[PDB]
Amino acid sequence: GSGFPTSEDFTPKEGSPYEAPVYIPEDIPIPADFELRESSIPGAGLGVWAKRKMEAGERLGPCVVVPRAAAKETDFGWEQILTDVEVSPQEGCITKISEDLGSEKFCVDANQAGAGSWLKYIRVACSCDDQNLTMCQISEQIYYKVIKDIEPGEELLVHVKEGVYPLGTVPPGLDE
């Protein structure tokens, strides 16, 4: 039986009988400014707690760096952001290199660690007095934009939704 050391007869433990404990072997890379942990807070659920503070104008990332023609499902809070031919002229927008935030002149902890799935954990604020959550959609990629300063110990960042995605914060009749 998978999940427990059975030790009954000469039954080969085939097929990789593995089960995920409290600490998952995935271990998704996250920015050091935020901690990912299972902590069910009544009214929200699980989220990534900022162990550090932020001041108004901050944005959580990276989530996804997926361009226009990167095969989007259908809608994530608009209708279809792939409404522009991504020709991408090779006379300007190329970026074959990547600026690394290392020990040169980069006292910024960004574009280093962060698969992106870490940002889908943050949910709607437990209380309407704690509303400080807004979704940002730029360059056809997803970011969580914070409203005002964050104090270490509260994660309120979500795409406001009252159905699935669209009518939550965007007009369901965009561009008429």
Side-chain angles (χ1 to χ4, degrees):
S2 306
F4 63 99
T6 310
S7 182
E8 192 60 78
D9 204 275
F10 301 95
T11 313
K13 296 180 60 178
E14 56 174 86
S16 183
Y18 183 80
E19 189 58 278
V22 294
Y23 193 97
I24 38 73
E26 305 177 88
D27 193 74
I28 303 176
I30 65 284
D33 247 69
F34 319 97
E35 60 181 280
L36 194 159
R37 58 155 64 239
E38 187 205 86
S39 52
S40 299
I41 178 271
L46 319 174
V48 296
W49 307 89
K51 63 257 290 194
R52 184 184 174 205
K53 38 60 74 61
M54 289 175 295
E55 49 180 66
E58 63 280 78
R59 168 272 300 128
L60 313 201
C63 190
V64 291
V65 65
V66 288
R68 290 67 187 202
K72 309 297 168 67
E73 304 73 61
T74 309
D75 176 34
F76 195 78
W78 5 264
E79 48 175 69
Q80 53 175 330
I81 37 60
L82 33 74
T83 181
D84 172 71
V85 61
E86 187 179 89
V87 56
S88 305
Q90 296 301 272
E91 59 189 278
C93 52
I94 301 175
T95 51
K96 63 176 70 68
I97 44 80
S98 53
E99 300 176 90
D100 180 53
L101 285 296
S103 308
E104 297 178 282
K105 290 171 292 178
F106 302 99
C107 192
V108 184
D109 191 273
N111 200 267
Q112 295 291 271
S117 187
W118 69 285
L119 276 176
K120 61 84 184 299
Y121 283 91
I122 4 203
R123 301 180 184 170
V124 192
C126 178
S127 35
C128 187
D129 303 272
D130 286 79
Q131 302 293 147
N132 188 78
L133 329 82
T134 293
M135 173 61 68
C136 175
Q137 193 277 329
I138 50 173
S139 308
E140 269 58 87
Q141 67 197 93
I142 305 301
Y143 282 112
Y144 289 65
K145 180 277 292 293
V146 204
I147 334 303
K148 35 110 288 177
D149 69 280
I150 294 295
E151 293 179 67
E154 58 179 280
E155 23 61 271
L156 306 315
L157 274 322
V158 76
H159 178 249
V160 180
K161 53 180 81 288
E162 59 181 280
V164 193
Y165 291 109
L167 79 172
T169 179
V170 313
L174 183 65
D175 188 68
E176 292 172 72

